[PDB]
């Protein structure tokens, strides 16, 4: 037997906004928050735009000093998570802080902080790193600095699941308080890899769109024009909280995580398998931990990251697992319009999928101008579609072939 | 209900030996693995030695070809799960592949990797950053690069939790297959943090030994002329098995892991409190999840990293915990020997605590020639202790004030 856990807060730093009402705002509009890299000399790259956080003020969670230690993925995990916690009301105290832990994730880690070390290692030598090098890019680092600023003394680690990060991060924060190891855990993802390490590493790879011409055009899940994926920036959590505590205390409870679902497909480092065996066997995973039949599902918040085989595998994982229902379901990629926040990407698309189920629109996907050969599922193509929805899928299928499945269901 | 869970094979990259067996005879025999680093140049850094893997062959394990895209980290995870595997005569088929999974992490991955790929393109340009610079880099291809090699498709994934992600890895890993998420997990960690930037940024924050002299002496945990911990390299993996799974295949049962806590200090990014309270929470945790009296407790594999603040938070824990039976248990650094394998240690410290059951024997803490103000507790100074041990604790706390305790018994 198993409690249930329910969404009480969320928070967010992304391409369209400073917060959850204000990137939600885009996502609705379908408005793009890609666009070319600034501050920085890309000319040798064959990348040159992606989705920056705009105008983010670390001030507003820490002090100058205290922020001057932390990479920038740390600082955007601190932000979604204190807006979370603040948008939860939760108060934290003795009788409860052993019962409130931390599992925020990131895919790539601490890489602009990695390499303004390498910068001052090969210019001047050693003695010019900073003494804060390694606490303040080491991804547990979010944790780590959250539990310390609030007093949390539950559970306190952190997932690095690639592309999955987010969506292994709630989950497995979920399953925490399900088995009465916490009460409330601070959940999701943090990421900022659009330096030069992440837009070369990528770009040496060929898995991002070179698209420079037509930036907010780049990202487009299932267009037969799609060239790779969009990198982009920061952070999502949530708090998660068991229904009876949330209850108690009069939260205001946006939607239940009623499943979780996880795979390994066993297959390649980079590629899925053609037919997506392994993200139809996480989505049915999510779907027997959840007790639901695949009929119930409403929308599905793709991985939809723009790439030529990743596209194509997750149509036919859904057709695989949905059936006759494949079509019944609306299914869209918030990526064609935020790009892929790697292992935040889980974590902004979990927020996606609770607010689909509050306001009862599909998110939709931009820029499918051209479906290609296959894509004839209801992927909402250009504008925000309202219809009922009372079960919302969110996946993740990331290198390593690691998949993640989370099923937000309504909550009245 | 909750499963019982055994450990069926353990593998093992370490200072002291290639494997489980030749690291164990050097445990036993109170062996240092530590020396001047020879891989690089270090005389513009503080600290020159640690604790290198010596004459390690990937090609006992991986082709040639592979193994120039991983970064060491990689390598050592594999080498050690390969092992671990082998070890539990466990075979993959179309009827488990599904129930098998793996939780491998790292606290700070292929910074190696990402030093020489960040020389690349500052000396170079992008042009010259590995194609292979993300999959051969991040910390969750151990676990999917062991899930493509043995056709693992259970849950697949990665803890980042800095000195504490060995031990979090395989108390998590238990917990899926506890709750019934899998059969089987292998689990631990791995480490090669002995770059520039590793040695430079341990050293710019003074937290490492500077013995270079004697680098044979200088990890020295309760010792009063400890100075810091000594960096090593690394990984260990167990295989975890549900028992009755185990018992049905006539596996060889080494021990079973009856017991996993976890608590957040909420205190320091790196300090732990003098008076060892999150770690005492953290035992306490786990002590109560094994359902055992403190006192049946006969052997703790201490994280013991020979700094000055974190040795002495130990004791006081151990004291507080165990009271009276603090005096009759025995505690014990291997990292006296090894050194600190961060990520890795919780791995290969819960190997030696499985091995200290199987043999009956508790491991030295050598160098241990003046214990310190208040360390008066039997350490096992110099040389290894046969004894009883029915029970066996392994502890972890890492930056962020993140803690992980294991709990062991003998299986009949
Ligand atoms: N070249 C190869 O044979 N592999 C597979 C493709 N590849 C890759 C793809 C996308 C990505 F983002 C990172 C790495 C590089 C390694
Ligand atoms: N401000 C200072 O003098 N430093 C930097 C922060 N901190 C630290 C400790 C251990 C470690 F491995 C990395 C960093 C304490 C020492
Ligand atoms: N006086 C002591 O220090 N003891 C008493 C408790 N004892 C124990 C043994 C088996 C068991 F099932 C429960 C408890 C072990 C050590």
Not at 8 to 29: H, K, N, Q, R, Y
Not at 206 to 214: G, H, I, K, V, Y
Not at 235 to 257: F, P
Request: charged share 20%; glycine share 12%.
């Amino acid at each position: 037997s198993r409690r249930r856990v329910v969404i009480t807060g969320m928070g967010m730093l992304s391409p369209l906004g400073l917060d959850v009402p204000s990137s939600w705002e885009g996502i609705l509009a379908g408005r793009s928050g890609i666009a070319p890299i600034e501050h920085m000399d890309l000319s040798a790259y064959s990348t040159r735009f992606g989705g920056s956080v705009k105008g983010f003020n670390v001030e507003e969670y820490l002090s100058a000093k205290e922020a001057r230690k932390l990479d920038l993925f740390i600082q955007y995990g601190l932000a979604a998570s204190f807006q979370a916690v603040r948008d939860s009301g939760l108060e934290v105290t003795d009788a409860n802080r052993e019962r409130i832990g931390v599992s925020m994730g990131s895919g790539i880690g601490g890489l602009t902080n990695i390499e303004n070390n390498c910068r001052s290692l090969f210019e001047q030598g050693p003695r010019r790193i900073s003494p804060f090098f390694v606490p303040g890019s080491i991804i547990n680092m979010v944790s780590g600095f959250l539990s310390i600023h609030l007093g949390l003394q539950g559970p306190n680690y952190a997932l690095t699941t690639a592309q999955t990060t987010g969506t292994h991060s709630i989950g497995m924060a979920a399953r925490n308080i399900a088995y009465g190891e916490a009460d409330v855990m601070v959940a999701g993802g943090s990421e900022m890899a659009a330096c030069g390490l992440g837009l070369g590493g990528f770009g040496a790879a060929r898995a991002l769109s070179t698209r420079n011409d037509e930036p907010t055009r780049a990202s487009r899940p299932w267009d037969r024009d799609r060239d790779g994926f969009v990198l982009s920036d920061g952070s999502g959590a949530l708090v998660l909280e068991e229904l009876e505590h949330a209850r108690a205390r009069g939260a205001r409870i946006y939607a239940e995580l009623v499943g979780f679902g996880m795979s390994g497909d066993a297959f390649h480092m980079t590629a899925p398998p053609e037919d997506g065996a392994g993200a139809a066997r996480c989505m049915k995973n999510a779907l027997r931990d959840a007790g639901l039949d695949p009929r119930q599902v409403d929308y599905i918040n793709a991985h939809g990251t723009s790439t030529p085989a990743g596209d194509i595998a997750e149509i036919a994982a859904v057709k695989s697992v949905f059936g006759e229902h494949a079509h019944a379901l609306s299914m869209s990629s918030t990526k064609s319009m935020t790009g892929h926040l790697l292992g935040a990407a889980g974590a902004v698309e979990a927020i996606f999928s609770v607010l689909a189920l509050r306001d009862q629109v599909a998110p939709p996907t931009i820029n499918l101008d051209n479906p290609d050969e296959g894509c004839d599922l209801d992927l909402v193509a250009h504008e925000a579609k309202p219809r009922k929805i009372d079960v919302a899928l969110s996946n993740s299928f990331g290198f390593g072939g690691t998949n993640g499945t989370l099923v937000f269901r309504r909550f009245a």
